[PDB]
Ligand SMILES: O=c1ccn([C@@H]2O[C@H](COP(=O)(O)OP(=O)(O)O)[C@@H](O)[C@H]2O)c(=O)[nH]1
């Protein structure tokens with residue numbers, strides 16, 4: 001009971017969730033954990049603190065209003081390095097006289113400066129990669145190549161430019177975030193271990209390639225235990241959400257009154273923003289189906305005029321935020337139109353839901369390529385070359401390809417083999433169970 005992990009996610013939903021889920025595993029194995037949330041995020045969730053994973057607050061420099069009050073992405077990350085470094089040190093020192101001093105920092109790989117804080121205080125330090133081995137390996141190859149990538153990639157020759165992370169195909173876009181994903185590797189060889197939210201059997205080739213460069217420990221998937229290994233009976237869902245929902249049994253009760261495989265689930269995660277015009281094509285494309293579609297509150301104005309008032313309530317429903325785990329487990333879902341965020345993707349693979357892949361940016365085009373051409377668990381929507389955006393007829397056809405055809409009955413078959421592979425990896429003797437045990441052994 002000696003060790004104590006301070007877990008520091010990037011302050012965004014797709015990072016806090018895998019970090020929190022990992023702390024639940026660690027707790028079940030006997031490791032005390034504290035999750036470090038920025039003050040802005042802490043005051044927006046108003047989390048419940050009567051649980052096994054304690055909360056500390058840190059600062060990113062934007063306590064009052066968070067990321068949106070920052071002038072720019074580069075200012076946000078630079079200020080987060082400054083205030084995050086001091087406030088993480090502040091937590092370490094505050095715990096020094098305690099019963100369990102902090103002994104280890106698990107920090108988002110996006111934040112390599114947290115390793116410097118951990119090393120200053122003599123702690124174990126491990127970066128935690130919330131994206132898959134293939135993506136991280138591609139970034140790693142580019143980092144050692146001075147931030148460039150020339151195709152084809154010898155060890156991954158099937159990758160075309162339209163499949164690389166958006167930073168390589170949209171020249172110059174988001175330079176602060178491109179620098180960030182490259183600099184994940186600035187010091188990661190000096191950490192005690194490198195953690196990845198994937199499982200070895202999902203990406204055998206890429207895990208082994210990347211491990212030659214630096215030993216990594218796959219410790220995923222971070223989907224709650226009740227849906228997979230079922231060894232942690234208290235781990236029943238995602239219980240830190242940055243978004244409010246209508247306390248939705250509303251959503252699951254409704255899915256129950258629908259025929260099996262009949263509903264198209266549409267969601268774009270917590271971050272991705274679609275333009276006026278992209279929302280028009282989408283709204284027209286999906287209205288040919290029975291659909292359950294998450295349109296985040298900030299995105300509603302970009303819906304076509306009078307759209308919310310003309311959805312057939314018998315066949316379709318529009319939500320502000322979904323209990324995505326319960327939706328993807330409900331058998332009313334015939335397919336998942338997704339932005340190919342890594343959590344959504346892994347969730348879809350394990351619940352055996354075939355995908356319509358509609359990536360937008362960052363690592364999402366990589367996940368899309370793997371969904372269609374490596375795992376063969378779905379089809380990618382074709383976007384216009386000159387205008388860049390997927391038109392209504394190409395989205396409707398992609399959904400059809402997954403819902404009905406001969407292509408459809410192949411992708412259902414292949415997508416169901418991943419659940420048991422993950423259950424095996426999480427059960428005793430599994431790949432991921434062994435790696436977690438290795439980490440727990442070092443920490444204490
Ligand atoms: O309406 C929604 C949309 C997303 N999610 C969850 O939010 C996470 C999104 O993470 P991902 O890596 O897919 O995408 P990002 O939001 O980081 O772009 C996932 O755990 C989803 O299950 C949810 O619960 N309800």
Ligand SMILES: *[C@@H]1O[C@H](CO)[C@@H](O)[C@H](O[C@@H]2O[C@H](CO)[C@@H](O)[C@H](O)[C@H]2O)[C@H]1O
Pocket residue numbers: 011012013067073242270271272
């Ligand atoms: C990275 O930059 C992009 C803008 O290009 C931001 O969307 C993102 O901010 C995230 O936005 C979410 C809400 O849509 C918040 O939940 C999240 O905490 C915040 O980090 C920047 O991270």
Ligand SMILES: *[C@@H]1O[C@H](CO)[C@@H](O)[C@H](O)[C@H]1O
Pocket residue numbers: 271272273274360361
């Ligand atoms: C960065 O760019 C993509 C579209 O190119 C958008 O989906 C994100 O919301 C934005 O941050």
Ligand SMILES: O=C(O)c1ccccc1Br
Pocket residue numbers: 010012014177181362363
């Ligand atoms: O790719 C991601 O997960 C991501 C999330 C949040 C901010 C920036 C990025 Br580049």
